[PDB]
Design a protein around this ligand. Structure first.
Ligand SMILES: Cc1cccc(O)c1
Ligand SMILES: Cc1cccc(O)c1
Ligand SMILES: Cc1cccc(O)c1
Ligand SMILES: Cc1cccc(O)c1
Ligand SMILES: Cc1cccc(O)c1
Ligand SMILES: Cc1cccc(O)c1
Ligand SMILES: Cc1cccc(O)c1
Ligand SMILES: Cc1cccc(O)c1
Ligand SMILES: Cc1cccc(O)c1
Ligand SMILES: [Cl-]
Ligand SMILES: [Cl-]
Ligand SMILES: [Zn+2]
Ligand SMILES: [Zn+2]
Lengths: 21, 28, 28, 21, 28, 21, 28, 21, 28, 21, 28, 21
């Protein structure tokens, strides 16, 4: 999930975009 | 658990910005 | 749409806190 | 929606719960 | 009371920083 | 109070110190 | 000390929200 | 105090409420 | 100048995220 | 400047890039 | 890298406040 | 730089002021 992927290592705004509607 | 709480707070603000009109679901 | 943007930023932070483990959905 | 309901007039942390999963 | 809510959120952050170790009091 | 004094007109970080403990 | 500074920043925002009209004192 | 209790482990909004006026 | 202050606070956060490693400049 | 351009009317994350280093 | 990302977010908000009219450059 | 100096140990608002324009 998002916490598992982005709190461990940094996520770009492009990677974060995967979690959008 | 605190470290993750802090991270999540920043995650949702970034999602707010990146998703824009699309919006999002945040599931911790 | 600027004041609307600002309000939404604060709503997201608020939902992050109130909802906790449940998570929330933000739809502009 | 939440913006219409909570950006024109203040929402209690309770009304905010309506938007939790 | 929304703009007032928004302003207060930023005032609290500001007092947190300026006051430092002293701490502060926020009374709406 | 701080809202009356600082939400109608901007306060310097100095006037803000009046609200420190 | 930084870790605590970061935490405290989030604490005061949550206090702002939860306490509402009651307000609060923040003593680090 | 609040830092000692809530920065070590997570506090719910109910636990935080103890620090209100 | 209060709404202007509030907007700027959110712009800075936004530039922090969009610019990333590049960094940004904020000139009021 | 950024305030004149982005505080009167909303700016896309793209227009915001104009202010990156 | 996350820890630093979180810190930097708080740094830029403090810079926004302290620098005021002067503004600043943020170079991570 | 600022991250190296202020993310390792805490910086006062006076130390941060060195990074202003
Ligand atoms: C923007 C952001 C916030 C928190 C964690 C991340 O990986 C990225
Ligand atoms: C989560 C929540 C809702 C309402 C009041 C509280 O203290 C906490
Ligand atoms: C808590 C909160 C944030 C933003 C708008 C509101 O009506 C309520
Ligand atoms: C704490 C404080 C107040 C005013 C100016 C500063 O640079 C810092
Ligand atoms: C620093 C700050 C925040 C919010 C309102 C103000 O007048 C000043
Ligand atoms: C809401 C919140 C912020 C920081 C620490 C906590 O335990 C809880
Ligand atoms: C950095 C950036 C700009 C625009 C869109 C994005 O998803 C990310
Ligand atoms: C992203 C953002 C923040 C503040 C004002 C704007 O126009 C845009
Ligand atoms: C105000 C602040 C934020 C982040 C790191 C610091 O050393 C100081
Ligand atoms: Cl943090
Ligand atoms: Cl705002
Ligand atoms: Zn943070
Ligand atoms: Zn705001």
């Amino acid at each position: 999930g998002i916490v598992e992927q982005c709190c461990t290592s940094i996520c770009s705004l492009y990677q974060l975009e995967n979690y959008c509607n | 658990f605190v470290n993750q709480h802090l991270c999540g707070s920043h995650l949702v603000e970034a999602l707010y910005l990146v998703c824009g009109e699309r919006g999002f679901f945040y599931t911790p």
